[PDB]
Ligand binder design. Sequence first.
Ligand SMILES: [Mg+2]
Ligand SMILES: [Mg+2]
Ligand SMILES: [Mg+2]
Ligand SMILES: [Mg+2]
Ligand SMILES: [Mg+2]
Ligand SMILES: [Mg+2]
Ligand SMILES: [Mg+2]
Ligand SMILES: [Mg+2]
Ligand SMILES: [Mg+2]
Ligand SMILES: [Mg+2]
Ligand SMILES: [Mg+2]
Ligand SMILES: [Mg+2]
Ligand SMILES: [Mg+2]
Ligand SMILES: [Mg+2]
Ligand SMILES: [Mg+2]
Ligand SMILES: [Mg+2]
Ligand SMILES: [Mg+2]
Ligand SMILES: [Mg+2]
Ligand SMILES: [Mg+2]
Ligand SMILES: [Mg+2]
Ligand SMILES: [Mg+2]
Ligand SMILES: [Mg+2]
Ligand SMILES: [Mg+2]
Ligand SMILES: [Mg+2]
Ligand SMILES: [Mg+2]
Ligand SMILES: [Mg+2]
Ligand SMILES: [Mg+2]
Ligand SMILES: [Mg+2]
Ligand SMILES: [Mg+2]
Ligand SMILES: [Mg+2]
Ligand SMILES: [Mg+2]
Ligand SMILES: [Mg+2]
Ligand SMILES: [Mg+2]
Ligand SMILES: [Mg+2]
Ligand SMILES: [Mg+2]
Ligand SMILES: [Mg+2]
Ligand SMILES: [Mg+2]
Ligand SMILES: [Mg+2]
Ligand SMILES: [Mg+2]
Ligand SMILES: [Mg+2]
Ligand SMILES: [Mg+2]
Ligand SMILES: [Mg+2]
Ligand SMILES: [Mg+2]
Ligand SMILES: [Mg+2]
Ligand SMILES: [Mg+2]
Ligand SMILES: [Mg+2]
Ligand SMILES: [Mg+2]
Ligand SMILES: [Mg+2]
Ligand SMILES: [Mg+2]
Ligand SMILES: [Mg+2]
Ligand SMILES: [Mg+2]
Ligand SMILES: [Mg+2]
Ligand SMILES: [Mg+2]
Ligand SMILES: [Mg+2]
Ligand SMILES: [Mg+2]
Ligand SMILES: [Mg+2]
Ligand SMILES: [Mg+2]
Ligand SMILES: [Mg+2]
Ligand SMILES: [Mg+2]
Ligand SMILES: [Mg+2]
Ligand SMILES: [Mg+2]
Ligand SMILES: [Mg+2]
Ligand SMILES: [Mg+2]
Ligand SMILES: [Mg+2]
Ligand SMILES: [Mg+2]
Ligand SMILES: [Mg+2]
Ligand SMILES: [Mg+2]
Ligand SMILES: [Mg+2]
Ligand SMILES: [Mg+2]
Ligand SMILES: [Mg+2]
Ligand SMILES: [Mg+2]
Ligand SMILES: [Mg+2]
Ligand SMILES: [Mg+2]
Ligand SMILES: [Mg+2]
Ligand SMILES: [Mg+2]
Ligand SMILES: [Mg+2]
Ligand SMILES: [Mg+2]
Ligand SMILES: [Mg+2]
Ligand SMILES: [Mg+2]
Ligand SMILES: [Mg+2]
Ligand SMILES: [Mg+2]
Ligand SMILES: [Mg+2]
Ligand SMILES: [Mg+2]
Ligand SMILES: [Mg+2]
Ligand SMILES: [Mg+2]
Ligand SMILES: [Mg+2]
Ligand SMILES: [Mg+2]
Ligand SMILES: [Mg+2]
Ligand SMILES: [Mg+2]
Lengths: 199, 66, 87
Amino acid sequence: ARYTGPSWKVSRRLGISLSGTGKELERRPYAPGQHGPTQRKKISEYGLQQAEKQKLRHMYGLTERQFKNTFNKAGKLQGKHGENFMILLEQRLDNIVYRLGLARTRRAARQLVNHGHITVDGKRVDIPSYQVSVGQVISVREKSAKNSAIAESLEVSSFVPEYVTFDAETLTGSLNRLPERSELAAEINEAFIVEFYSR
Amino acid sequence: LSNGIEVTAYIPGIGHNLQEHSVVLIRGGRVKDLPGVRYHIVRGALDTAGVENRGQSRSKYGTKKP
Amino acid sequence: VKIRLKRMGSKKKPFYRIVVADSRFPRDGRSIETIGTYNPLLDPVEVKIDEEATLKWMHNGAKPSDTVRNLLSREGIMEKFHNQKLG
RNA sequence: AAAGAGAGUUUGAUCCUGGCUCAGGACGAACGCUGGCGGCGUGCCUAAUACAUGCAAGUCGAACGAACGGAGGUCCAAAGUUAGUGGCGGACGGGUGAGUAACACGUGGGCAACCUGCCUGUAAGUUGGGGAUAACUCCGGGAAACCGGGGCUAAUACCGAAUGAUAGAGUGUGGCGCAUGCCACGCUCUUGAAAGAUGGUUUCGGCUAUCGCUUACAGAUGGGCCCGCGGUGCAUUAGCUAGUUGGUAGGGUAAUGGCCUACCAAGGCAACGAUGCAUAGCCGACCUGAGAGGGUGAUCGGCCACACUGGGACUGAGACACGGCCCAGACUCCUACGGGAGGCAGCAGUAGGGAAUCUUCCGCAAUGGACGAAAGUCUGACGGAGCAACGCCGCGUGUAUGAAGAAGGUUUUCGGAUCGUAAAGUACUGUUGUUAGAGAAGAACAAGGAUAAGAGUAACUGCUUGUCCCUUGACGGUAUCUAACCAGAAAGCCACGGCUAACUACGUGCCAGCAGCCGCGGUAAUACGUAGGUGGCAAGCGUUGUCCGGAUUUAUUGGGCGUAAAGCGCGCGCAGGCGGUCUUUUAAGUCUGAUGUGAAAGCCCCCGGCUUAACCGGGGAGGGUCAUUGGAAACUG
Ligand SMILES: [Mg+2]
Ligand SMILES: [Mg+2]
Ligand SMILES: [Mg+2]
Ligand SMILES: [Mg+2]
Ligand SMILES: [Mg+2]
Ligand SMILES: [Mg+2]
Ligand SMILES: [Mg+2]
Ligand SMILES: [Mg+2]
Ligand SMILES: [Mg+2]
Ligand SMILES: [Mg+2]
Ligand SMILES: [Mg+2]
Ligand SMILES: [Mg+2]
Ligand SMILES: [Mg+2]
Ligand SMILES: [Mg+2]
Ligand SMILES: [Mg+2]
Ligand SMILES: [Mg+2]
Ligand SMILES: [Mg+2]
Ligand SMILES: [Mg+2]
Ligand SMILES: [Mg+2]
Ligand SMILES: [Mg+2]
Ligand SMILES: [Mg+2]
Ligand SMILES: [Mg+2]
Ligand SMILES: [Mg+2]
Ligand SMILES: [Mg+2]
Ligand SMILES: [Mg+2]
Ligand SMILES: [Mg+2]
Ligand SMILES: [Mg+2]
Ligand SMILES: [Mg+2]
Ligand SMILES: [Mg+2]
Ligand SMILES: [Mg+2]
Ligand SMILES: [Mg+2]
Ligand SMILES: [Mg+2]
Ligand SMILES: [Mg+2]
Ligand SMILES: [Mg+2]
Ligand SMILES: [Mg+2]
Ligand SMILES: [Mg+2]
Ligand SMILES: [Mg+2]
Ligand SMILES: [Mg+2]
Ligand SMILES: [Mg+2]
Ligand SMILES: [Mg+2]
Ligand SMILES: [Mg+2]
Ligand SMILES: [Mg+2]
Ligand SMILES: [Mg+2]
Ligand SMILES: [Mg+2]
Ligand SMILES: [Mg+2]
Ligand SMILES: [Mg+2]
Ligand SMILES: [Mg+2]
Ligand SMILES: [Mg+2]
Ligand SMILES: [Mg+2]
Ligand SMILES: [Mg+2]
Ligand SMILES: [Mg+2]
Ligand SMILES: [Mg+2]
Ligand SMILES: [Mg+2]
Ligand SMILES: [Mg+2]
Ligand SMILES: [Mg+2]
Ligand SMILES: [Mg+2]
Ligand SMILES: [Mg+2]
Ligand SMILES: [Mg+2]
Ligand SMILES: [Mg+2]
Ligand SMILES: [Mg+2]
Ligand SMILES: [Mg+2]
Ligand SMILES: [Mg+2]
Ligand SMILES: [Mg+2]
Ligand SMILES: [Mg+2]
Ligand SMILES: [Mg+2]
Ligand SMILES: [Mg+2]
Ligand SMILES: [Mg+2]
Ligand SMILES: [Mg+2]
Ligand SMILES: [Mg+2]
Ligand SMILES: [Mg+2]
Ligand SMILES: [Mg+2]
Ligand SMILES: [Mg+2]
Ligand SMILES: [Mg+2]
Ligand SMILES: [Mg+2]
Ligand SMILES: [Mg+2]
Ligand SMILES: [Mg+2]
Ligand SMILES: [Mg+2]
Ligand SMILES: [Mg+2]
Ligand SMILES: [Mg+2]
Ligand SMILES: [Mg+2]
Ligand SMILES: [Mg+2]
Ligand SMILES: [Mg+2]
Ligand SMILES: [Mg+2]
Ligand SMILES: [Mg+2]
Ligand SMILES: [Mg+2]
Ligand SMILES: [Mg+2]
Ligand SMILES: [Mg+2]
Ligand SMILES: [Mg+2]
Ligand SMILES: [Mg+2]
């Protein structure tokens, strides 16, 4: 991926349990390093905006320049800026693979997309940043097929969001309709990232 | 300089291997401490040498990775 | 005055414009009036042409090239030009 | 629909004014540390400095000079597929930005004041003669570029003749305009043309097909000239000019014009900036900005100028001509000392200047050029390959699990915390990579053979169109695809007191040093060096140089002049700016409709094509105090 370091470190510093359910924050919820269990300090507006940017960036696991380019392209759309930015972030192939049950984290989905183990409309895709559209399907092209990892991922995969429909008999998933901000993270404040990029 | 300009430059870093009639590479940037000095010297781009025993800010002072 | 074929696009990916221009001008330089498109990469060739300004230029003395002649023949401009000359 | 962020710094503390500095974006960039790959682009910004070496413009035997098989005479050999004169092209294509402040460029017009090879169409004609000349061969001068003389011969080479002007004059008729003048037609006289070559048929004479040549008329194309408006600094640059200003005649050019000449009068331009000095190619456009504006002219497209410096002309439809000619000048080279040759701001490449920029590569396969009837030749245009993290976009260095927590660093209030699920273990994959194989598009053709139908013909041959048969790849075994192995072969830079995200210990002690500013360093340093930790970015990260923003810090949008910088000491007044009330009239300003135009590429919107993106394609929109013209009359005139 972009970054192969420890995953509990970034979540502990950020304050939220991204890519999991509190299991990274079960113990010592303070920031990493030797400082953070000792004391804290004040937070300014710049700190809050940077924190929200990090929330998004390390939640979706994509680099900074591509993040800003996606924000700029989302600005081209019509509607509220942050909502469009988030919903275009939700169009990522990695996000669809992860939330569809074929994996468990963002890293697993990214690697499983890099090797081409999935396919859209019978076309092998090695691009994690591929933007899925309405009616596009996914599959496994019988590469992993009877693989232990995908079976385990489908076992422990919570549930499926209502904006995507997936059946496990043929491992087929497709976007029902466009997701809304209502069915999204909501641990973040999307109103601050636009201001942060506005300075 | 290349245009015959009397230019007073500053030597950064700890220690240097500079002397008279030596080729030096002058770079922009003035220091407020000296009333006349207005330019810096790049370390490691010409006859000028780097700085020994440097671990931090190694890109400047012209020291390679140890 | 020739109804020429101008090349643009990208490396190893050419696309062509059927355009009329003078023989003394650069291939990608000054021209008079573009009339069509020509795409070679697709196995079935997609050629769009006005078929009305082309006949006017042919009447006025615009000699085409070999491939432009082939395209006008396949699209029927040459046969209609012969019919107009007869009629 | 669009619609603008601030912080530090003068004081013992304040509030204003004001400057300085910083937080962002962009480069044809450079330097330092570092460095895995793929796609698309860019690369002498300085010396328009000087140039080794090779290649960049040649082509036509259908107008006049080859070896073989081989008629003929065991021996030599006749006819059958290959230099130059002549025609076309060299004025295109390609490169630089020196010069130029002007009709050079942008935009919009005018030419009743113009030209134009090749291309297309039409109307007529291609009828008869002559004298030569290269090539070739002898005689000489020759160091050599090469010079002269004698003899000989062709043509689509050259020069007269028959005939033919919408060319000159003279006239008439009719219709007309924007003053000069334009158009249709008629009459008399005087001048101006040609060339043939490859076939077919016929009788062989003839006739005929294709390509050719002469004249005239239109179209298309490319140029020429004139004009309104528009885009820089200095007034510590105020007068400049004399073929200048106008006229009368003339010469010259494709054309108007002091473009040039003789004569006549003394004019003309200028504070609405003449003249002069300095810098600079212009535009579409690029960077920034909320916008108005500000800066620039990298890549690409259009126009202009130049080709070692300065001047000139010939040939040609088109040149005062990059790889053509003559003269002078500087430089390089050869010489037998009399004299000769050269011009990379063409593609590669060398030396020098620089902080700084690439191979002395492949091919005409595709597109386009020149020649030819065609095959075909040439094409450093162009299509491609090589180098440089120079820029944009894309992907990787693994993934899940793994503990009160391996081992060991950093600290410890020496109980512990921290690196940290990070490790080992555990289960899995091969995007990259290695090994072995299958492997495209870009290709349309041109020509050649059959056809079918037309025009033309007495008939053909041929011509135009349509349908088939056969042939053509530098890239290149390239993209791509298929299988086996592998967590192994792949992470660095800057920063951490505030501006601004992120702290502990040790060493040093106004020293070493840091620094954009506030300023830190004199023994308890979160600012100096190192170690641990943390933050940002990522095959990149920092520093410097230039531009815009922040800067309302030239304020039209959008500031001011009592005391902070800022009201002339006052008056009279030319030019200029502004102007009480009402009516009628005009449409200069103002507002609006229609026509033409503001090239392509670029920004923007919608669709698509490359596995996505960058990138590419289609359509649309935007942009003017623009020309023609029709409207309204409140306001300014
Ligand atoms: Mg430092
Ligand atoms: Mg062709
Ligand atoms: Mg918008
Ligand atoms: Mg500051
Ligand atoms: Mg900004
Ligand atoms: Mg570098
Ligand atoms: Mg290195
Ligand atoms: Mg790359
Ligand atoms: Mg240059
Ligand atoms: Mg010859
Ligand atoms: Mg040119
Ligand atoms: Mg230029
Ligand atoms: Mg004769
Ligand atoms: Mg003779
Ligand atoms: Mg003779
Ligand atoms: Mg006559
Ligand atoms: Mg007559
Ligand atoms: Mg008129
Ligand atoms: Mg007559
Ligand atoms: Mg005659
Ligand atoms: Mg012919
Ligand atoms: Mg001929
Ligand atoms: Mg302009
Ligand atoms: Mg300008
Ligand atoms: Mg005259
Ligand atoms: Mg200049
Ligand atoms: Mg650009
Ligand atoms: Mg502004
Ligand atoms: Mg530019
Ligand atoms: Mg250039
Ligand atoms: Mg240009
Ligand atoms: Mg030159
Ligand atoms: Mg030179
Ligand atoms: Mg002439
Ligand atoms: Mg030339
Ligand atoms: Mg040359
Ligand atoms: Mg060159
Ligand atoms: Mg050199
Ligand atoms: Mg070619
Ligand atoms: Mg060709
Ligand atoms: Mg050649
Ligand atoms: Mg080239
Ligand atoms: Mg090329
Ligand atoms: Mg470079
Ligand atoms: Mg790059
Ligand atoms: Mg990248
Ligand atoms: Mg590794
Ligand atoms: Mg591992
Ligand atoms: Mg693991
Ligand atoms: Mg210890
Ligand atoms: Mg791990
Ligand atoms: Mg093997
Ligand atoms: Mg093979
Ligand atoms: Mg292979
Ligand atoms: Mg035929
Ligand atoms: Mg045929
Ligand atoms: Mg066929
Ligand atoms: Mg055949
Ligand atoms: Mg064949
Ligand atoms: Mg060919
Ligand atoms: Mg080959
Ligand atoms: Mg090969
Ligand atoms: Mg391959
Ligand atoms: Mg194997
Ligand atoms: Mg092995
Ligand atoms: Mg391997
Ligand atoms: Mg393995
Ligand atoms: Mg590994
Ligand atoms: Mg690496
Ligand atoms: Mg320090
Ligand atoms: Mg460290
Ligand atoms: Mg770090
Ligand atoms: Mg301003
Ligand atoms: Mg003020
Ligand atoms: Mg006042
Ligand atoms: Mg005062
Ligand atoms: Mg007063
Ligand atoms: Mg005063
Ligand atoms: Mg007064
Ligand atoms: Mg007045
Ligand atoms: Mg009034
Ligand atoms: Mg346009
Ligand atoms: Mg372009
Ligand atoms: Mg697409
Ligand atoms: Mg584009
Ligand atoms: Mg487009
Ligand atoms: Mg378009
Ligand atoms: Mg628009
Ligand atoms: Mg009135």
